[PDB]
Design a protein around this nucleic acid. Structure first.
Ligand SMILES: [Mg+2]
Ligand SMILES: [Mg+2]
Length: 326
DNA sequence: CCGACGGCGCATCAGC
DNA sequence: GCTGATGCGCC
DNA sequence: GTCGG
Protein backbone atom coordinates (compact mmCIF):
# COMPACT_ATOMS: atom_id res chain seq x y z
CA UNK A 1 0.00 0.00 0.00
CA UNK A 2 2.47 2.58 -1.27
CA UNK A 3 -0.32 5.02 -1.99
CA UNK A 4 -2.78 4.27 0.82
CA UNK A 5 -3.47 7.93 1.52
CA UNK A 6 -4.43 8.65 -2.09
CA UNK A 7 -6.51 5.52 -2.56
CA UNK A 8 -8.49 6.24 0.64
CA UNK A 9 -9.12 9.82 -0.53
CA UNK A 10 -10.45 8.52 -3.82
CA UNK A 11 -12.57 5.88 -2.08
CA UNK A 12 -14.08 8.52 0.20
CA UNK A 13 -14.83 10.67 -2.85
CA UNK A 14 -16.40 7.66 -4.55
CA UNK A 15 -18.63 7.04 -1.53
CA UNK A 16 -19.70 10.69 -1.46
CA UNK A 17 -20.67 10.70 -5.12
CA UNK A 18 -22.63 7.48 -4.66
CA UNK A 19 -24.27 8.09 -1.29
CA UNK A 20 -24.90 11.85 -1.36
CA UNK A 21 -24.62 13.10 -4.95
CA UNK A 22 -26.31 9.98 -6.33
CA UNK A 23 -23.89 10.21 -9.27
CA UNK A 24 -23.18 6.58 -10.12
CA UNK A 25 -20.64 7.22 -12.89
CA UNK A 26 -18.58 9.54 -10.73
CA UNK A 27 -18.70 6.78 -8.12
CA UNK A 28 -17.36 4.25 -10.64
CA UNK A 29 -14.73 6.68 -11.99
CA UNK A 30 -13.34 7.26 -8.52
CA UNK A 31 -13.21 3.50 -7.83
CA UNK A 32 -11.52 2.72 -11.14
CA UNK A 33 -8.93 5.41 -10.36
CA UNK A 34 -8.38 4.19 -6.79
CA UNK A 35 -7.99 0.65 -8.07
CA UNK A 36 -5.49 1.46 -10.81
CA UNK A 37 -3.45 3.50 -8.32
CA UNK A 38 -3.64 0.73 -5.70
CA UNK A 39 -1.84 -1.74 -7.96
CA UNK A 40 0.76 0.76 -9.22
CA UNK A 41 4.09 -0.49 -7.81
CA UNK A 42 5.70 2.91 -7.07
CA UNK A 43 5.10 5.56 -4.44
CA UNK A 44 3.45 8.35 -6.44
CA UNK A 45 5.39 11.66 -6.46
CA UNK A 46 2.93 13.88 -8.32
CA UNK A 47 -0.43 14.13 -10.03
CA UNK A 48 1.23 14.11 -13.47
CA UNK A 49 2.74 10.67 -12.73
CA UNK A 50 -0.69 9.41 -11.64
CA UNK A 51 -2.40 10.84 -14.71
CA UNK A 52 -0.40 8.42 -16.88
CA UNK A 53 -2.61 5.64 -15.49
CA UNK A 54 -5.85 4.73 -17.29
CA UNK A 55 -8.77 6.07 -15.26
CA UNK A 56 -6.90 8.98 -13.70
CA UNK A 57 -7.68 12.25 -15.45
CA UNK A 58 -7.12 15.97 -14.93
CA UNK A 59 -9.43 16.45 -11.96
CA UNK A 60 -8.00 13.51 -10.03
CA UNK A 61 -4.48 14.59 -10.97
CA UNK A 62 -5.22 17.95 -9.36
CA UNK A 63 -6.60 16.37 -6.18
CA UNK A 64 -3.55 14.14 -5.98
CA UNK A 65 -1.25 17.18 -6.14
CA UNK A 66 -3.25 18.90 -3.36
CA UNK A 67 -3.14 15.74 -1.27
CA UNK A 68 0.62 15.21 -1.63
CA UNK A 69 1.21 18.88 -0.87
CA UNK A 70 -0.87 19.06 2.29
CA UNK A 71 -1.86 15.56 3.39
CA UNK A 72 -5.53 16.32 2.83
CA UNK A 73 -8.30 17.46 0.53
CA UNK A 74 -10.27 20.61 1.39
CA UNK A 75 -13.16 19.23 -0.67
CA UNK A 76 -13.30 16.21 1.64
CA UNK A 77 -12.75 18.38 4.72
CA UNK A 78 -15.90 20.32 3.85
CA UNK A 79 -17.86 17.17 3.09
CA UNK A 80 -16.92 15.77 6.52
CA UNK A 81 -18.25 18.95 8.17
CA UNK A 82 -21.57 18.82 6.34
CA UNK A 83 -24.23 17.36 8.63
CA UNK A 84 -26.60 16.19 5.92
CA UNK A 85 -23.78 14.52 3.97
CA UNK A 86 -22.40 12.97 7.16
CA UNK A 87 -25.80 11.64 8.15
CA UNK A 88 -26.55 10.24 4.70
CA UNK A 89 -23.15 8.58 4.50
CA UNK A 90 -23.75 6.98 7.92
CA UNK A 91 -27.21 5.61 7.19
CA UNK A 92 -26.11 3.97 3.92
CA UNK A 93 -23.75 1.80 6.00
CA UNK A 94 -26.78 -0.27 7.04
CA UNK A 95 -27.45 -3.05 4.55
CA UNK A 96 -30.68 -2.29 2.72
CA UNK A 97 -30.47 1.49 3.18
CA UNK A 98 -29.22 3.07 -0.03
CA UNK A 99 -28.77 6.69 -1.18
CA UNK A 100 -32.52 7.25 -1.62
CA UNK A 101 -33.64 5.70 1.68
CA UNK A 102 -30.90 7.46 3.64
CA UNK A 103 -31.92 10.88 2.34
CA UNK A 104 -35.59 10.05 3.00
CA UNK A 105 -34.83 9.04 6.59
CA UNK A 106 -32.74 12.16 7.19
CA UNK A 107 -35.77 14.18 6.00
CA UNK A 108 -37.87 12.45 8.66
CA UNK A 109 -35.31 13.25 11.33
CA UNK A 110 -34.05 9.68 11.48
CA UNK A 111 -30.27 10.12 11.30
CA UNK A 112 -28.46 8.17 14.02
CA UNK A 113 -28.12 4.58 15.14
CA UNK A 114 -30.38 5.49 18.06
CA UNK A 115 -33.03 6.96 15.77
CA UNK A 116 -33.02 3.79 13.74
CA UNK A 117 -33.24 1.57 16.81
CA UNK A 118 -36.41 3.29 17.97
CA UNK A 119 -38.02 3.34 14.51
CA UNK A 120 -37.73 -0.29 13.53
CA UNK A 121 -41.32 -0.18 12.30
CA UNK A 122 -40.15 2.21 9.57
CA UNK A 123 -37.69 -0.29 8.07
CA UNK A 124 -38.36 -3.01 5.53
CA UNK A 125 -37.22 -6.55 6.29
CA UNK A 126 -33.79 -6.24 4.75
CA UNK A 127 -33.12 -2.91 6.50
CA UNK A 128 -34.29 -4.30 9.85
CA UNK A 129 -31.82 -7.19 9.69
CA UNK A 130 -29.05 -4.87 8.45
CA UNK A 131 -29.71 -2.69 11.51
CA UNK A 132 -29.86 -5.75 13.78
CA UNK A 133 -26.34 -6.82 12.80
CA UNK A 134 -24.93 -3.41 11.97
CA UNK A 135 -21.73 -3.77 13.97
CA UNK A 136 -21.17 -7.41 13.06
CA UNK A 137 -21.48 -6.69 9.36
CA UNK A 138 -18.54 -4.26 9.42
CA UNK A 139 -16.15 -6.83 10.86
CA UNK A 140 -14.06 -8.87 8.43
CA UNK A 141 -13.82 -12.65 8.42
CA UNK A 142 -10.44 -14.24 9.04
CA UNK A 143 -9.57 -16.84 6.42
CA UNK A 144 -9.50 -19.49 9.17
CA UNK A 145 -13.15 -18.84 9.96
CA UNK A 146 -13.93 -18.79 6.24
CA UNK A 147 -12.44 -22.28 6.07
CA UNK A 148 -14.68 -23.51 8.90
CA UNK A 149 -17.68 -21.92 7.20
CA UNK A 150 -16.72 -23.61 3.91
CA UNK A 151 -16.54 -27.00 5.62
CA UNK A 152 -20.00 -26.53 7.10
CA UNK A 153 -21.60 -25.36 3.83
CA UNK A 154 -19.98 -28.02 1.63
CA UNK A 155 -20.87 -30.82 4.06
CA UNK A 156 -24.50 -29.75 4.59
CA UNK A 157 -25.04 -29.41 0.86
CA UNK A 158 -23.58 -32.91 0.32
CA UNK A 159 -26.09 -34.20 2.89
CA UNK A 160 -28.97 -32.73 0.88
CA UNK A 161 -27.84 -34.21 -2.47
CA UNK A 162 -24.43 -35.64 -3.35
CA UNK A 163 -24.78 -34.12 -6.83
CA UNK A 164 -24.76 -30.53 -5.61
CA UNK A 165 -21.45 -28.78 -6.05
CA UNK A 166 -20.84 -25.73 -3.88
CA UNK A 167 -17.91 -23.44 -4.55
CA UNK A 168 -16.84 -20.55 -2.31
CA UNK A 169 -15.98 -17.60 -4.55
CA UNK A 170 -15.39 -13.91 -3.92
CA UNK A 171 -12.25 -12.69 -2.16
CA UNK A 172 -11.91 -16.18 -0.60
CA UNK A 173 -11.31 -17.81 -3.99
CA UNK A 174 -8.90 -14.96 -4.71
CA UNK A 175 -6.93 -16.12 -1.67
CA UNK A 176 -7.63 -13.20 0.67
CA UNK A 177 -6.52 -13.51 4.30
CA UNK A 178 -9.85 -12.01 5.28
CA UNK A 179 -13.19 -11.61 3.51
CA UNK A 180 -16.04 -9.14 3.91
CA UNK A 181 -18.51 -11.99 3.57
CA UNK A 182 -19.17 -15.48 2.17
CA UNK A 183 -20.09 -16.05 -1.46
CA UNK A 184 -21.24 -19.50 -2.47
CA UNK A 185 -21.82 -20.61 -6.04
CA UNK A 186 -24.12 -23.62 -6.25
CA UNK A 187 -24.71 -26.09 -9.08
CA UNK A 188 -26.87 -29.17 -9.51
CA UNK A 189 -27.13 -31.27 -12.70
CA UNK A 190 -30.94 -30.88 -12.63
CA UNK A 191 -30.67 -27.15 -13.38
CA UNK A 192 -29.04 -26.30 -16.71
CA UNK A 193 -29.54 -23.65 -19.39
CA UNK A 194 -31.66 -26.29 -21.07
CA UNK A 195 -34.02 -27.38 -18.30
CA UNK A 196 -35.07 -27.18 -14.65
CA UNK A 197 -35.81 -30.84 -13.96
CA UNK A 198 -36.18 -30.13 -10.24
CA UNK A 199 -37.80 -27.22 -8.32
CA UNK A 200 -36.75 -25.87 -4.90
CA UNK A 201 -33.06 -26.62 -5.58
CA UNK A 202 -31.87 -23.46 -3.80
CA UNK A 203 -34.60 -23.65 -1.17
CA UNK A 204 -33.69 -27.22 -0.09
CA UNK A 205 -30.12 -26.11 0.49
CA UNK A 206 -31.09 -22.96 2.42
CA UNK A 207 -33.50 -24.95 4.60
CA UNK A 208 -30.86 -27.52 5.53
CA UNK A 209 -28.47 -24.70 6.49
CA UNK A 210 -31.21 -23.09 8.60
CA UNK A 211 -32.02 -26.46 10.15
CA UNK A 212 -28.46 -26.75 11.49
CA UNK A 213 -28.58 -23.17 12.75
CA UNK A 214 -25.95 -21.93 10.34
CA UNK A 215 -28.22 -19.58 8.39
CA UNK A 216 -29.92 -17.38 10.97
CA UNK A 217 -31.61 -14.67 8.90
CA UNK A 218 -32.78 -13.97 5.35
CA UNK A 219 -32.45 -10.60 3.59
CA UNK A 220 -33.98 -11.76 0.34
CA UNK A 221 -34.55 -15.02 -1.50
CA UNK A 222 -35.66 -16.15 -4.96
CA UNK A 223 -35.16 -19.24 -7.14
CA UNK A 224 -31.50 -18.61 -8.00
CA UNK A 225 -30.20 -16.14 -5.41
CA UNK A 226 -30.16 -16.13 -1.64
CA UNK A 227 -28.95 -13.20 0.45
CA UNK A 228 -28.80 -13.74 4.20
CA UNK A 229 -26.96 -14.08 7.46
CA UNK A 230 -24.98 -16.96 8.95
CA UNK A 231 -22.97 -17.76 12.09
CA UNK A 232 -20.31 -20.28 13.09
CA UNK A 233 -21.19 -22.35 16.16
CA UNK A 234 -19.17 -21.41 19.24
CA UNK A 235 -17.66 -23.77 21.81
CA UNK A 236 -18.80 -24.20 25.41
CA UNK A 237 -18.25 -21.02 27.45
CA UNK A 238 -16.94 -19.11 24.43
CA UNK A 239 -18.12 -15.73 23.18
CA UNK A 240 -20.21 -16.15 20.05
CA UNK A 241 -18.73 -15.47 16.63
CA UNK A 242 -20.06 -12.38 14.87
CA UNK A 243 -23.00 -12.85 12.52
CA UNK A 244 -21.84 -12.92 8.88
CA UNK A 245 -23.35 -12.04 5.51
CA UNK A 246 -23.80 -14.98 3.12
CA UNK A 247 -24.81 -14.91 -0.54
CA UNK A 248 -25.65 -18.13 -2.40
CA UNK A 249 -26.11 -18.12 -6.14
CA UNK A 250 -27.48 -21.10 -8.08
CA UNK A 251 -26.05 -21.16 -11.61
CA UNK A 252 -26.97 -23.53 -14.47
CA UNK A 253 -24.40 -26.34 -14.32
CA UNK A 254 -23.44 -26.12 -17.97
CA UNK A 255 -22.73 -22.42 -17.33
CA UNK A 256 -20.37 -22.88 -14.39
CA UNK A 257 -17.29 -21.22 -15.90
CA UNK A 258 -19.03 -17.95 -16.70
CA UNK A 259 -20.67 -18.17 -13.27
CA UNK A 260 -17.47 -18.73 -11.34
CA UNK A 261 -15.69 -16.00 -13.31
CA UNK A 262 -18.44 -13.60 -12.25
CA UNK A 263 -18.56 -14.64 -8.58
CA UNK A 264 -14.80 -14.63 -8.16
CA UNK A 265 -14.60 -10.92 -9.09
CA UNK A 266 -13.36 -8.59 -7.91
CA UNK A 267 -16.21 -6.25 -8.83
CA UNK A 268 -13.79 -3.78 -10.42
CA UNK A 269 -11.96 -6.62 -12.18
CA UNK A 270 -15.33 -7.70 -13.55
CA UNK A 271 -16.22 -4.21 -14.83
CA UNK A 272 -12.84 -3.80 -16.45
CA UNK A 273 -13.00 -7.24 -18.03
CA UNK A 274 -16.56 -6.77 -19.26
CA UNK A 275 -15.79 -3.29 -20.61
CA UNK A 276 -12.78 -4.78 -22.45
CA UNK A 277 -14.93 -7.58 -23.89
CA UNK A 278 -17.24 -4.89 -25.27
CA UNK A 279 -14.29 -3.08 -26.85
CA UNK A 280 -13.30 -6.44 -28.39
CA UNK A 281 -16.89 -6.95 -29.58
CA UNK A 282 -18.27 -9.41 -27.02
CA UNK A 283 -20.55 -9.26 -24.03
CA UNK A 284 -19.97 -11.23 -20.84
CA UNK A 285 -22.49 -11.97 -18.10
CA UNK A 286 -22.55 -14.73 -15.45
CA UNK A 287 -24.11 -17.19 -17.89
CA UNK A 288 -22.52 -16.70 -21.29
CA UNK A 289 -20.09 -14.84 -23.49
CA UNK A 290 -21.76 -13.79 -26.76
CA UNK A 291 -20.59 -11.88 -29.86
CA UNK A 292 -21.96 -8.46 -30.67
CA UNK A 293 -23.38 -8.51 -34.20
CA UNK A 294 -22.97 -5.53 -36.54
CA UNK A 295 -26.26 -4.14 -35.22
CA UNK A 296 -25.15 -4.06 -31.60
CA UNK A 297 -27.24 -7.07 -30.65
CA UNK A 298 -25.68 -10.00 -28.79
CA UNK A 299 -25.42 -13.25 -30.73
CA UNK A 300 -25.67 -16.85 -29.57
CA UNK A 301 -23.51 -18.14 -26.66
CA UNK A 302 -19.96 -19.06 -27.63
CA UNK A 303 -18.69 -22.44 -26.41
CA UNK A 304 -16.82 -22.23 -23.09
CA UNK A 305 -15.22 -25.16 -21.28
CA UNK A 306 -12.85 -23.30 -18.98
CA UNK A 307 -12.46 -19.90 -17.34
CA UNK A 308 -9.47 -19.46 -19.63
CA UNK A 309 -11.61 -19.80 -22.76
CA UNK A 310 -13.32 -16.58 -21.71
CA UNK A 311 -10.00 -14.73 -21.40
CA UNK A 312 -8.91 -16.20 -24.77
CA UNK A 313 -11.98 -14.76 -26.55
CA UNK A 314 -11.14 -11.21 -25.51
CA UNK A 315 -7.42 -11.68 -26.13
CA UNK A 316 -6.38 -11.39 -22.49
CA UNK A 317 -3.78 -13.69 -20.99
CA UNK A 318 -5.29 -15.82 -18.24
CA UNK A 319 -5.29 -14.34 -14.76
CA UNK A 320 -5.42 -16.63 -11.75
CA UNK A 321 -8.00 -15.60 -9.14
CA UNK A 322 -5.25 -14.35 -6.81
CA UNK A 323 -4.45 -11.75 -9.48
CA UNK A 324 -8.02 -10.45 -9.98
CA UNK A 325 -8.12 -8.48 -6.74
CA UNK A 326 -8.72 -5.11 -8.36
C1' DC B 1 -16.82 17.56 -28.16
C1' DC B 2 -19.89 13.78 -26.41
C1' DG B 3 -21.92 9.22 -25.98
C1' DA B 4 -20.94 5.48 -23.11
C1' DC B 5 -19.66 3.75 -18.87
C1' DG B 6 -21.14 -4.29 -16.78
C1' DG B 7 -24.65 -7.01 -16.13
C1' DC B 8 -28.25 -8.90 -13.58
C1' DG B 9 -31.37 -10.99 -8.96
C1' DC B 10 -34.89 -9.75 -5.61
C1' DA B 11 -38.07 -6.34 -3.30
C1' DT B 12 -41.07 -2.51 -3.81
C1' DC B 13 -44.27 0.39 -6.08
C1' DA B 14 -47.05 2.97 -9.75
C1' DG B 15 -50.13 2.25 -13.11
C1' DC B 16 -53.42 -0.46 -15.37
C1' DG C 1 -52.58 -9.90 -10.64
C1' DC C 2 -49.19 -8.24 -14.30
C1' DT C 3 -45.41 -5.48 -16.37
C1' DG C 4 -42.01 -2.06 -16.23
C1' DA C 5 -39.26 1.31 -13.38
C1' DT C 6 -36.59 2.04 -9.52
C1' DG C 7 -33.86 0.89 -5.32
C1' DC C 8 -30.39 -1.97 -3.54
C1' DG C 9 -27.58 -5.56 -3.69
C1' DC C 10 -23.97 -9.11 -5.74
C1' DC C 11 -19.18 -9.89 -8.05
C1' DG D 1 -14.82 11.82 -13.83
C1' DT D 2 -12.53 9.63 -17.73
C1' DC D 3 -12.09 7.71 -22.02
C1' DG D 4 -12.38 6.80 -27.23
C1' DG D 5 -13.96 7.97 -31.76
MG1 LIG E 1 -17.58 -11.43 -0.66
MG1 LIG F 1 -21.24 -11.27 -1.04
Amino acid sequence: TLNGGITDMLTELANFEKNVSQAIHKYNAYRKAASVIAKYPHKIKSGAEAKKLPGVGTKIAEKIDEFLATGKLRKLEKIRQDDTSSSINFLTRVSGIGPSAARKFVDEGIKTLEDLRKNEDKLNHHQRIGLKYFGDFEKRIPREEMLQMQDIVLNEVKKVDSEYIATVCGSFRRGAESSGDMDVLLTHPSFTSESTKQPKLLHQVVEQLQKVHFITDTLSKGETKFMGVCQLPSKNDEKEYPHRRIDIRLIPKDQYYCGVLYFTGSDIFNKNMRAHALEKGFTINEYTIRPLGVTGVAGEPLPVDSEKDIFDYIQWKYREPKDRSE
